[PDB]
């Protein structure tokens, strides 16, 4: 079956975001005119959140838990599946086939997912995702 889904998590293998985890939102098994291959709109991060401890202050954790999102189109072959998953309904409509244009769209689309990942990582769900794969 098409075990790849849009509530799914994956990894990047190439193109300036490898070694960083992502999530699928919109697969296209035969692509489009542009992106003429099986691709998927995805989102992930660019700067992982640093670890925190007991003794850190509010300001320290505030500095450490800033996080950089990203959104990109990718060939399927340049990813790897993952058994883990994530809740995806929050940021479905902000991203779109047209959202990768006129980056007034793109930057707000980054900011929504920035707040989303921040509120998620605080009271951390998907700890495995939010921690950096080491390599």
């Amino acid at each position: 079956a098409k075990f790849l889904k849009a509530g799914k998590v994956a990894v990047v293998v190439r193109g300036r975001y490898a070694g960083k985890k992502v999530v699928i939102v919109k697969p296209h098994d035969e692509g489009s005119k542009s992106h003429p291959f099986g691709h998927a709109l995805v989102a992930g991060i660019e700067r992982y959140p640093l670890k925190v401890t007991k003794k850190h202050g509010a300001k320290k954790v505030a500095k450490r838990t800033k996080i950089k999102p990203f959104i990109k189109v990718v060939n399927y072959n340049h990813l790897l599946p993952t058994r883990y998953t994530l809740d995806v309904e929050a940021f479905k409509s902000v991203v779109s086939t047209e959202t990768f244009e006129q980056p007034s769209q793109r930057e707000e689309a980054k900011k929504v997912v920035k707040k989303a990942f921040e509120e998620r990582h605080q009271a951390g769900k998907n700890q495995w995702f939010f921690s950096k794969l080491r390599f």
Partner: protein, 112 residues
């Protein structure tokens, strides 16, 4: 045929004291002292040549900016773009197999 003089005091045909000839405005040939070649930097895992990088003399790298000695992704100025891909998924799969051994050991100690 005009004949040419070494400009430096080393007379010998060494690796370094090399000679390219070039004709000049004033109408007399002279020798011109080329310097040694670069080499492609290489892959610490692959032993392969890696792209995007300027083949420059080693101190000469200090002049150029960050871009020419680098590419964008992680493991930029050292690696192959395939050896990275191999090791990353190695680190992912055996990271999952750590969980596999976790479920094995917790199963047998639960049996104990």
């Amino acid at each position: 045929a005009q004949r040419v003089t070494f400009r430096r005091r080393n007379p010998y045909n060494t690796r370094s004291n090399k000679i390219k000839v070039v004709k000049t405005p004033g109408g007399i040939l002279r020798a011109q002292h080329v310097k040694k070649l670069a080499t492609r930097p290489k892959c610490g895992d692959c032993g392969s040549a890696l792209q995007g990088i300027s083949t420059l003399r080693p101190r000469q790298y200090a002049t150029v900016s960050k871009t020419h000695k680098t590419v964008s992704r992680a493991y930029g100025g050292s690696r192959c773009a395939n050896c990275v891909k191999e090791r990353i998924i190695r680190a992912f799969l055996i990271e999952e197999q750590k969980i596999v051994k976790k479920v094995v050991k917790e199963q047998t100690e639960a049996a104990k």
